[PDB]
Amino acid sequence: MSKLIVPQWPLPKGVAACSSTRIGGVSLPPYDSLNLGAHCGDNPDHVEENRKRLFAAGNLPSKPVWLEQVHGKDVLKLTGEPYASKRADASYSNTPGTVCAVMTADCLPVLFCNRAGTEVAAVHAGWRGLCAGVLEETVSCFADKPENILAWLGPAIGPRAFEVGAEVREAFMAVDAKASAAFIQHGDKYLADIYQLARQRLANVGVEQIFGGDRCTYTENETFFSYRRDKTTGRMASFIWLI
Amino acid sequence: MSKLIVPQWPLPKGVAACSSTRIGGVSLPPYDSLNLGAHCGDNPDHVEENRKRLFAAGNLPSKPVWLEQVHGKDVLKLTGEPYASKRADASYSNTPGTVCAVMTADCLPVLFCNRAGTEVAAVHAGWRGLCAGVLEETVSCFADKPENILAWLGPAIGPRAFEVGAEVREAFMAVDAKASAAFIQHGDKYLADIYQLARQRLANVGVEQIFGGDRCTYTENETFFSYRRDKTTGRMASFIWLI
Ligand SMILES: [Zn+2]
Numbered sequence: 001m002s003k004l005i006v007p008q009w010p011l012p013k014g015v016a017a018c019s020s021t022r023i024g025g026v027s028l029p030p031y032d033s034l035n036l037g038a039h040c041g042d043n044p045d046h047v048e049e050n051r052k053r054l055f056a057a058g059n060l061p062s063k064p065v066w067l068e069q070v071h072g073k074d075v076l077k078l079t080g081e082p083y084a085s086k087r088a089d090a091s092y093s094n095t096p097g098t099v100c101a102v103m104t105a106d107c108l109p110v111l112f113c114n115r116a117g118t119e120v121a122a123v124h125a126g127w128r129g130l131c132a133g134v135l136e137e138t139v140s141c142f143a144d145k146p147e148n149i150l151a152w153l154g155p156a157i158g159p160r161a162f163e164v165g166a167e168v169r170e171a172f173m174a175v176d177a178k179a180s181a182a183f184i185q186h187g188d189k190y191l192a193d194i195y196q197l198a199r200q201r202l203a204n205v206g207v208e209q210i211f212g213g214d215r216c217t218y219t220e221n222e223t224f225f226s227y228r229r230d231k232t233t234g235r236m237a238s239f240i241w242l243i
Numbered sequence: 244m245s246k247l248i249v250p251q252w253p254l255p256k257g258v259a260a261c262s263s264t265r266i267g268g269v270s271l272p273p274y275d276s277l278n279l280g281a282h283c284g285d286n287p288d289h290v291e292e293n294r295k296r297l298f299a300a301g302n303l304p305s306k307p308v309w310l311e312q313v314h315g316k317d318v319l320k321l322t323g324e325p326y327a328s329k330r331a332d333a334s335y336s337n338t339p340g341t342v343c344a345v346m347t348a349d350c351l352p353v354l355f356c357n358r359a360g361t362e363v364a365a366v367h368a369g370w371r372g373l374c375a376g377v378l379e380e381t382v383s384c385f386a387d388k389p390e391n392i393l394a395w396l397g398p399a400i401g402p403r404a405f406e407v408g409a410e411v412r413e414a415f416m417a418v419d420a421k422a423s424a425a426f427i428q429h430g431d432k433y434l435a436d437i438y439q440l441a442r443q444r445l446a447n448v449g450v451e452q453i454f455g456g457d458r459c460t461y462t463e464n465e466t467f468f469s470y471r472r473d474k475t476t477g478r479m480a481s482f483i484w485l486i
């Protein structure tokens with residue numbers, strides 16, 4: 001009964017993508033059902049069961065190439081299983097069968113693929129990496145032209161729960177003063193719209209086509225895990241790959 | 244104008260309580276008339292006005308101490324504004340003037356107080372915190388004995404609309420098989436009686452005096468906001484305090 005989100009976009013013929021929810025797994029509170037993360041304290045066998053179940057649900061051709069997400073802006077081109085460091089917050093693939101995966105629980109998941117369906121990419125974009133331009137570095141790994149790139153914004157904490165400090169807002173404006181529209185005042189802090197921020201950097205890059213960005217990990221607690229909300233909790237993941 | 248629900252129970256001397264409804268406000272759809280929630284996308288000034296009307300109608304001594312409800316089971320004791328964190332789903336107070344409040348739109352609201360009139364508490368009981376035991380934790384905050392504690396169940400999504408998966412039912416039965424009675428199958432799901440579950444947990448702790456729990460936020464769409472019913476909508480709240 002694993003419920004799986006399918007990105008609403010003109011998915012190209014040779015591309016398959018899926019994003020998970022906290023439902024249909026086997027873990028117990030505070031990671032109650034489909035927790036894919038192996039680093040939040042959950043029962044290690046349950047995490048294996050959840051992964052085994054989601055891979056089947058998603059018809060993944062092979063195991064996802066999990067990164068060592070350090071909230072930076074480095075993109076790891078999945079050229080071949082023999083890697084040095086998997087340390088990074090994005091992956092790019094031009095290889096059929098290889099699975100791009102990003103692990104999240106509030107941070108912005110973003111999936112990319114060219115219209116021809118010959119190259120994909122997955123990104124975990126927290127504010128720091130977002131601000132440092134992880135989306136720009138990902139896009140630049142694409143041989144194709146921005147014009148031909150599709151971007152899907154996965155479930156993340158929305159503009160009603162993503163409360164951030166004044167530095168975060170000033171951090172963004174100090175790169176593209178137009179980020180001012182993504183912040184609304186809420187006391188000595190602001191309510192940021194990570195989707196709006198992504199769209200801006202994406203536009204700056206040329207990517208005219210963007211979908212998703214209509215969910216909230218924090219608010220829809222019955223569907224997603226949320227680090228901001230629960231502190232100790234499970235993890236969801238977004239996957240893309242060339243068939 | 245600001246129709247205010249008054250708990251039907253043996254209200255003690257120095258205690259006052261009220262619970263709001265969607266009527267008598269200033270908001271427009273999908274939050275038409277008295278929305279109290281400031282984080283559901285409503286017009287803040289309207290929310291600002293809806294709150295001022297209620298506080299007057301309710302004749303509250305001060306502004307309510309809004310919590311950061313995360314659907315957990317943490318209870319916050321209101322002894323001094325400088326608080327480490329506001330993250331909680333229940334509040335307790337033995338200080339006059341202090342207003343305990345919980346914001347809802349389906350989840351179970353519960354107000355507490357002792358027969359003496361020296362202790363009060365409010366609880367936002369989502370199904371997880373209810374299961375994880377937020378009512379027991381709230382009670383164990385009272386210096387008085389359960390025998391003397393009065394409990395009121397405010398409007399929540401009733402037993403004819405609160406549909407849940409096998410997980411919910413199982414989670415509850417895990418804690419106490421007796422919880423099987425609050426569930427009645429509907430297709431591949433069940434119909435839960437949140438009030439029934441509250442009463443059981445309340446009884447396990449010796450709370451002999453329980454009132455209310457005859458409403459349904461979902462069904463009575465002309466009186467309450469419903470999260471299950473409307474996806475985007477306002478919020479009601481329940482208030483209690485020592486005069
Ligand atoms: Zn993150």
Ligand SMILES: [Zn+2]
Nearest residue numbers: 314347350369
């Ligand atoms: Zn709730």
